[PDB]
Amino acid sequence: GSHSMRYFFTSVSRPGRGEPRFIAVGYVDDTQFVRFDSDAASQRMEPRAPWIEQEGPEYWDGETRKVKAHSQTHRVDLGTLRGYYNQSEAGSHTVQRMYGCDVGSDWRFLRGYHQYAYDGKDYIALKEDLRSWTAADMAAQTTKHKWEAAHVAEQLRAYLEGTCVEWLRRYLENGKETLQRTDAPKTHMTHHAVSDHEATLRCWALSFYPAEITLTWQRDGEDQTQDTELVETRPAGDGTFQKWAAVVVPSGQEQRYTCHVQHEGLPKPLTLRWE
Amino acid sequence: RVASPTSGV
Amino acid sequence: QRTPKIQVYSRHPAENGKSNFLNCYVSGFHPSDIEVDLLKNGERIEKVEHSDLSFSKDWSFYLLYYTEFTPTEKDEYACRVNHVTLSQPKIVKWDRDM
Ligand SMILES: [Mg+2]
Ligand SMILES: [Mg+2]
């Protein structure tokens, strides 16, 4: 299938005392593989997947140097943004940054992204051309002109189409036993009577990877959305994901209802009926 | 591999 | 700004008397500062870990809080969440069917 590498950075200012909390995480697809937390003891980029542990001291030194530098850039940015928005020094504010690259089934570059937010709202983002900028407001427009003058997009484009994809491919090979393995959802249906007259059927998908999945209900072969509930896909905690969809039905009429499960790990979609 | 930090905002 | 969505659930299908993991997944919230406790019979569980802070496309944060637990007929488990968006802590009881 297709693959991605993404890095996520969060900095939160601490007006009362000290410097911002800074947390960075890296993912390949839906697998976290590195982290940095300013509150942690190591003050280093740390491994979070077995397949990255083999990287040598040069790797860990460089990653640490770069991520610590990111944290300082965000610290300064928090100050700059406070000024741009004429805000008090008294409140906590947040900067977030996310970037990454997608490759296709042939592992060739598909798309790149790099976006930045202040207090949870879009601030500035690299457009899909990897040349242009979307600035959400006039502060961001100031930043955009600064970033033009500093050749920021050129550097990001080079990283996104080069280093990003090259190292993604490296990771995919080194962690192939898990990263290139799909875990099909284990599926079953439960039944929960609400009265003599009706019952909830709940269609479960468990222990699947990657997280992308579609669960749908049909009645007599046509999509049903009335009287249904679909929960957000959630992490099991062991690297896999879970989801369920439920429908309320007249008791005795269960066989009219089918749950349909689509997932990359399934050659053909599954159909479940109450047994 | 992480990118080098960008210019400040 | 944005209030947390909460799901409380087990890692594995629950069977009374069999060890498992109790999860509280909080998502869609902003800012990132949040208080999450897992409760057994109303009391805070001490050994609770959480994932590293990350966020979605819309910039809202998500975290998984988790601890080992053993479902029983008698014990009630729950997740208690506080956040600047909430007037008072929100408590969501664990239901093994969800
Ligand atoms: Mg440029
Ligand atoms: Mg509160």
Q: The domain spanning residue A205 has which CATH number?
A: 2.60.40.10
Q: Are residues A196 and A120 in the same domain?
A: no
For residue A245, what are the β-bridge partners?
Answer: A203, A230
Amino acid found at A248 = V
DSSP label at A255?
G
Q: Are residues A152 and A216 in the same domain?
A: no
- Kindly list the residues from chain C whose CB atom is less than 8 angstroms away from the CB atom of residue A27: 54
Cα first-last separation, chain C: 28
DSSP string, A105-146: TT--EEEEEEEEEETTEEEEEE-TTSS-EEE-SHHHHHHHHH
- Residue A120's region, left for phi above 0, alpha for psi from -120 to 50, else beta, is left
Residue A267 structure tokens = 């050659």
Q: Is residue A67 part of a domain?
A: yes
**Which residue, of A118, A152, A181, is where some domain finishes?**
A181
Contact C26, C6 (CB under 8 A): yes
Q: How far apart are CA A197 and CA A251, in angstroms?
A: 5
Nearest Cβ partner for A69 among B1, B5, B7: B5
Asked if residue A193 and residue A77 are part of one domain, the reply reads no
Structure tokens belonging to residue A26: 């890296």
Strand order in the sheet with A222-224: A222-224, A214-219, A257-262, A270-272
How many alpha carbons fall within 13 Å on the CB side of residue A156?
27
Q: What is the DSSP letter of A119?
A: T
Sign of the dihedral defined by the CA atoms of residues C64, C70, C71, C73, in that order: negative
Tell me, yes or no, whether A196 and A258 share the same domain: yes
CA distance A53 to A51: 6
Q: Is B9 within 8 Å of A24 when comparing Cβ atoms?
A: no
Q: Are the C-beta atoms of residues C84 and C92 closer than 8 Å to each other?
A: no
Terminal Cα-to-Cα distance of chain A (whole angstroms): 34
Q: Are A234 and A222 in contact (CB under 8 A)?
A: no
Pull the structure tokens for residue A77: 């940015």
Residue type, A168: L
Task: Note whether A210 and A264 are within 8 A (CB).
Answer: yes
Residue given tokens 């790149």 in the structure block: A112
| Token output for A205 | 């998908």
Query: Does A246 lie in the same domain as A173?
Result: no
How many separate domains does chain A show? 2
Best mutation target, A73, A151, A161, to test chain B (most B CBs within 10 A): A73
Ligand 1 centroid from CA A9, angstroms: 22
> Could you please report the per-residue DSSP string of A179-215?
HT--BPPEEEEEEEE-SSSEEEEEEEEEEEBSS--EE
Place of tokens 């905690």: A237
Domain check: are A134 and A266 in the same one?
no
Last residue of a domain, one of A149, A181, A213: A181
- Work out the number of other CB atoms within 10 angstroms of the CB of residue A12: 20
Same domain, yes or no: A142 and A16:
yes
Nearest to A141, CA basis, from A122, A162, A160: A122
**C1-98 architecture in CATH?**
Sandwich (2.60)
- Tell me how far apart the alpha carbons of residues A262 and A22 are, in angstroms, rounded to a whole number: 37
Is residue A93 in a domain? yes
- Are C35 and C84 a contacting pair, CB within 8 Å? no
In chain B, which residues have their Cβ closer than 8 Å to the Cβ of A159?
A: 3-4
In chain B, which residues have their Cβ closer than 8 Å to the Cβ of A147? 6-7
Distance CA A222, CA A258 (A): 9
Pick from A36, A7, A209, A35: nearest CA to A112: A7
Helices (H), A50-201: 57-84, 138-149, 152-161, 163-174, 176-179
**CB contact set of A161 (below 8 Å; sequence gap of 6+):** A101, A109, A112, A130
The token pair that represents C20 in the structure block: 């498992």
CATH number of the domain encompassing residue A76: 3.30.500.10
Residues A130, A47 within the same domain: yes
Give the mutation candidate from A55, A77, A124, A170 for the B interface (greatest B CB count, under 10 A).
A77
Query: Of A160, A181, A202, which residue sits at a domain end?
Result: A181
Q: How far does the CA of residue A202 sit from the closest CA of chain B (Å)?
A: 42
C-alpha A152 to ligand 1 mean position (Å): 5
What does the domain layout of chain C look like in residue ranges?
A: 1-98
Residues A127 and A77 in one domain: yes
* A103 neighbors A4 (Cβ within 8 angstroms): yes
**Nearest bound ligand to CA A133?**
1
In a domain, A275, yes or no: no
Coil vs helix vs strand at A126: strand
With beta carbons less than 8 A apart as the criterion, state whether A4 and A102 touch: yes
Q: Do A146 and B6 touch (CB under 8 A)?
A: no
- Give the residue numbers spanning the domain of A31: 1-181
Handedness of CA A61, A33, C49, C86 (dihedral sign): positive
Same-domain status, A198 and A172: no
| In a shared domain, residues A152 and A207 | no
DSSP 8-state secondary structure symbol assigned to residue A86 = T
Longest Cα–Cα distance of chain B, Å, equals 23
Check whether residue A36 and residue A168 sit in a common domain.
yes
C-alpha of residue A231 to centroid of ligand 2, in Å: 25
Chain C meets chain A (3+ C-beta pairs below 8 A): yes
Three-state SS string over chain C comes to: CECCEEEEEECCCCCCCCCEEEEEEEEEEECCCCEEEEEECCEECCCCEECCCEECCCCCEEEEEEEEECCCCCCCEEEEEECCCCCCCEEEECCCCC
